[PDB]
Amino acid sequence: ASVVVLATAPDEATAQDLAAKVLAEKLAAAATLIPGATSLYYWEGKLEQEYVVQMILKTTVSHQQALLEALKSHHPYQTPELLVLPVTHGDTDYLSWLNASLR
Amino acid sequence: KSSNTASVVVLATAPDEATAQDLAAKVLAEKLAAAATLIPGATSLYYWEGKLEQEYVVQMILKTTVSHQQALLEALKSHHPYQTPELLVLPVTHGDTDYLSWLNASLR
Amino acid sequence: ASVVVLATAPDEATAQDLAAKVLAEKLAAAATLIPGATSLYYWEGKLEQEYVVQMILKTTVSHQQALLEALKSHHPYQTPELLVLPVTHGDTDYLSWLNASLR
Numbered sequence: 001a002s003v004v005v006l007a008t009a010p011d012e013a014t015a016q017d018l019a020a021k022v023l024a025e026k027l028a029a030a031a032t033l034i035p036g037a038t039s040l041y042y043w044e045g046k047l048e049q050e051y052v053v054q055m056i057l058k059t060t061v062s063h064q065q066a067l068l069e070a071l072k073s074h075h076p077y078q079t080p081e082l083l084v085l086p087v088t089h090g091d092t093d094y095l096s097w098l099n100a101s102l103r
Numbered sequence: 104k105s106s107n108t109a110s111v112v113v114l115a116t117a118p119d120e121a122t123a124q125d126l127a128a129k130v131l132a133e134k135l136a137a138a139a140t141l142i143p144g145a146t147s148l149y150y151w152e153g154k155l156e157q158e159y160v161v162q163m164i165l166k167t168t169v170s171h172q173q174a175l176l177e178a179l180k181s182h183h184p185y186q187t188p189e190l191l192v193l194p195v196t197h198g199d200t201d202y203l204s205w206l207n208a209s210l211r
Numbered sequence: 212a213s214v215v216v217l218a219t220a221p222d223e224a225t226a227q228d229l230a231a232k233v234l235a236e237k238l239a240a241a242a243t244l245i246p247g248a249t250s251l252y253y254w255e256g257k258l259e260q261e262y263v264v265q266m267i268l269k270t271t272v273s274h275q276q277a278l279l280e281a282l283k284s285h286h287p288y289q290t291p292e293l294l295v296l297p298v299t300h301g302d303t304d305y306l307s308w309l310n311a312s313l314r
Contacts, residue, residue, distance in 0.1 A: 030252040084197035089295035149241035190302040
């Protein structure tokens with residue numbers, strides 16, 4: 001089964017580095033980067049807003065744990081946003097390519 | 104961590120950054136979501152009475168838990184200027200445990 | 212029930228064309244186009260990076276197959292990134308409208 005992983009990085013340099021690392025290690029098949037986003041959350045009763053690059057990574061269930069572990073390790077921040085969403089269907093050729101890319 | 108409620112992602116669109124900021128700030132302050140990502144500069148296409156509408160929107164990605172999702176959807180609906188707001192819940196099947204713990208802690 | 216389809220297109224014109232076609236055919240209710248993204252993946256041992264428009268289309272489980280096939284047919288690429296994610300819940304009026312809009 002395939003999955004989508006949502007992760008954020010603090011800047012473009014970091015997003016590139018993260019993607020390059022996990023792609024080289026064959027922990028993900030592909031990564032989409034979307035710069036120019038904003039993340040909002042509370043920290044110690046204050047509304048914080050930070051620039052982020054949204055990442056959308058594609059991998060398989062077999063690799064999801066290892067991918068999260070690698071992203072967490074290489075990410076500069078302590079507790080980065082790392083979430084896995086299930087893929088229930090898709091283009092047969094794409095999903096095969098995704099799986100083959102991690103062999 | 105046994106005390107964590109399962110997490111979900113909510114995809115919501117807002118018509119502009121003004122509204123996106125307002126929606127996010129309100130639901131975060133009301134502890135109905137833990138975090139929101141805003142992605143401006145998007146376009147939404149859809150038909151309305153035979154017309155292909157093309158509107159500029161902000162894509163929001165909100166994080167919350169399954170126990171809070173309904174209250175979040177209702178708050179977003181109330182605060183959203185539009186009558187038929189695009190608000191969708193996606194399941195999170197796995198995540199980093201520390202992040203999920205923080206997500207839960209933020210709502211409690 | 213409802214689903215979202217995550218699809219990428221190589222440019223705005225193509226994303227607009229794809230969305231316009233599947234909306235006219237009532238295979239999707241709506242499409243969000245997010246420009247200013249890139250996609251990273253390995254090809255022939257080399258890290259590639261290409262500009263993409265990220266699409267998020269909304270449809271029902273009843274139409275997802277026809278939607279994937281239509282997107283595949285109209286997409287310029289041989290192996291297009293087309294992925295389906297499940298929607299568990301959503302705005303009641305929105306979901307009603309989504310269902311009503313389809314063929």
